[PDB]
């Protein structure tokens, strides 16, 4: 697919398929890429894997279907997993779209007022922490004496942690120095599945 | 044990021209076929060029036909990727592979960003408590890194020393500028006890700043 949310300890499965047969000299080898980190092949020639790659993952397949299976998922199995073929065997060398992974996502749940040393450059940033929740989903609101505002506000959120498998965002929201003095209430409001109501964090200058 | 290292990578503008490095070193380089590997912004992965150890020397992607070169120096166990008539398309982290069928080895990546606007380093804001109610227990602080191009920057917390409960967050581009944040969240009896530092490296404009995380007034 291009998804895959599996609990700890169950199975998961990938499936690629390619346009022409590739059984022939090698060649279709599988990569994981972890968050923020480069590539690495875990299976080579269909179903040998690498060194180093633990028993857990399996390649099959033959032609032009293979499968990459997982018997018992854990933690420092979540990231990326791509298909590829040999750039000699049939060329140039293509991989897959994306292992079944795509997101959203990015406050802060602690919110801190502009510092000084930035409203001296005539800036001003309110920034709101909205660390370790999980499902990613979440909605975060700005309001600015009670009126929402959409504008000038960046949201962005972390891949999934391997340690607690939670995400984390980070909301800016950004004026000009004569704008933030002229409001008195900051809020940063976040709607998430976890509370009936949304979660409020604010300080008035 | 075996490393690669690439470097050259940064801005350019279209029509200029990047030479990117790699540094191989834990095994005897000229055995093995090497292979760059770029990636797009948000985008998967895709083959630019190989060159082997053989009489001849290379492959290419199409579009990158004439345009780049792959080389290798193996009395200085370098590979190189020349780089002339770049394209907005070619604005990516370019990897260097050292396959055996199958790229077993990859270096970190470095990042070309083909594009007309200029380099502007950022600026690094302390992000403080501004309430006494989270107090005792955990504090978490910030560091704001705002206003830079291109990526990337790097943070760290305490030179690497704070490396559990940290959220670098993604940054946000607009108006050509990028700006993103980094929580940390450390024991209250550790801060304001002992410093608490965000060290931000911006090679683009060789800015390299610390800002000690000081408790307002």
């Known amino acids: 697919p291009h998804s895959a949310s599996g609990p700890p300890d169950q199975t998961v499965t990938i499936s690629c398929s390619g346009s022409?047969?590739?059984?022939?000299?090698?060649?279709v080898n599988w990569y994981q890429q972890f968050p923020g980190k480069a590539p690495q092949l875990l299976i080579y020639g269909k179903d040998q894997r690498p060194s180093g790659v633990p028993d857990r993952f399996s390649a099959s397949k033959s032609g032009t279907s293979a499968s990459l299976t997982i018997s018992g998922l854990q933690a420092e199995d979540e990231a990326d997993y791509y298909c590829?073929?040999?750039?000699?065997?049939?060329?140039?060398?293509?991989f897959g779209g994306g292992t079944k992974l795509t997101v959203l996502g990015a406050p802060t749940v602690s919110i801190f007022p502009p510092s000084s040393e930035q409203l001296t450059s005539g800036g001003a940033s309110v920034v709101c922490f909205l660390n370790n929740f999980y499902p990613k989903d979440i909605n975060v609101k700005w309001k600015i004496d009670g009126s929402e505002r959409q504008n000038g506000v960046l949201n962005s959120w972390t891949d999934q942690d391997s340690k607690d498998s939670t995400y984390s965002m980070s909301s800016t929201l950004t004026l000009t120095k004569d704008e933030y003095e002229r409001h008195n209430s900051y809020t940063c409001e976040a709607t998430h599945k976890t509370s009936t109501s949304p979660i409020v964090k604010s300080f008035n200058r | 044990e075996v490393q690669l290292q690439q470097s050259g990578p940064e801005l350019v503008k279209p029509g200029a021209s990047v030479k990117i490095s790699c540094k191989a070193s834990?095994?005897?380089?000229?055995?093995?076929?090497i292979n760059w590997m770029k990636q797009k912004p948000g985008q998967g992965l895709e083959w630019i060029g190989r060159?082997?150890?053989?009489?001849?020397?290379?492959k290419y992607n199409d579009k990158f036909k004439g345009k780049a070169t792959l080389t290798e120096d193996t009395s200085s166990n370098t590979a190189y990727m020349q780089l002339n008539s770049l394209t907005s398309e070619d604005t990516a982290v370019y990897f260097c592979?050292?396959?055996?069928?199958?790229?077993?080895?990859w270096g970190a990546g470095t990042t070309v960003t083909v594009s007309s606007a200029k380099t502007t380093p950022p600026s690094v804001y302390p992000l403080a408590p501004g309430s006494a109610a989270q107090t005792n227990s955990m504090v978490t602080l910030g560091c704001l890194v705002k206003g830079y191009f291109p990526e990337p920057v790097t943070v760290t917390w305490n030179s690497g020393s704070l490396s559990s409960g940290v959220h670098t967050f993604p940054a946000v581009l607009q108006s050509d500028l990028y700006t993103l944040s980094s929580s940390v969240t450390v024991p209250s009896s550790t801060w304001p006890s002992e410093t608490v530092t965000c060290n931000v490296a911006h090679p683009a404009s060789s800015t390299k700043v610390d800002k000690k995380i000081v408790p307002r007034d």
């Open positions: 022409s047969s590739n059984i022939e000299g090698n060649t």
């Open positions: 834990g095994y005897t380089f000229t055995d093995y076929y």
């Open positions: 592979a050292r396959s055996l069928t199958f790229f077993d080895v």
């Open positions: 590829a073929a040999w750039d000699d065997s049939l060329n140039g060398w293509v």
């Open positions: 060159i082997y150890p053989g009489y001849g020397n290379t």
